[PDB]
Amino acid sequence: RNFKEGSDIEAGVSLYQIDPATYQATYDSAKGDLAKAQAAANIAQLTVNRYQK
Amino acid sequence: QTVRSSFNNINASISSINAYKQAVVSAQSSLDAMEAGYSVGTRTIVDVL
């Protein structure tokens, strides 16, 4: 729990931090793919730039 | 014969240059094709060589 029970809480405020294991892990998932996704476009743009010249 | 011998030669000779002269042009950009492709490094330098 992030809070003192009965207390006054702001909106969008973290209250209970829940195990983000499968999640932080999961978050890693798209991360590499993002890392890998961008990787492809990297070359592609790397190519396009060349072809441009 | 000799009259017709070389008179052909020169003309065919003419055709020669026109081919290679183009052909030079062929290699010419061909070189250029390389350098840019190497300049951008899309390709090796060896090719340019």
Side-chain angles (χ1 to χ4, degrees), chain A residues 20-34:
Chain A
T22 189
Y23 301 90
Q24 182 61 58
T26 300
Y27 179 80
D28 288 342
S29 176
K31 188 188 298 178
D33 298 348
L34 175 64

Side-chain angles (χ1 to χ4, degrees), chain B residues 32-44:
Chain B
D32 289 339
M34 294 298 95
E35 297 183 354
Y38 174 74
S39 64
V40 291
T42 63
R43 296 191 298 279
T44 186

Side-chain angles (χ1 to χ4, degrees), chain A residues 47 49-51 53, chain B residues 36 39-42:
Chain A
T47 63
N49 298 339
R50 290 172 173 78
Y51 291 91
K53 296 175 180 176
Chain B
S39 64
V40 291
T42 63

Side-chain angles (χ1 to χ4, degrees), chain B residues 9-29:
Chain B
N9 299 344
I10 179 170
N11 297 335
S13 176
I14 296 169
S15 179
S16 177
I17 298 168
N18 298 129
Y20 305 135
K21 189 183 292 178
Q22 177 66 261
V24 177
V25 174
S26 66
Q28 183 57 59
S29 298

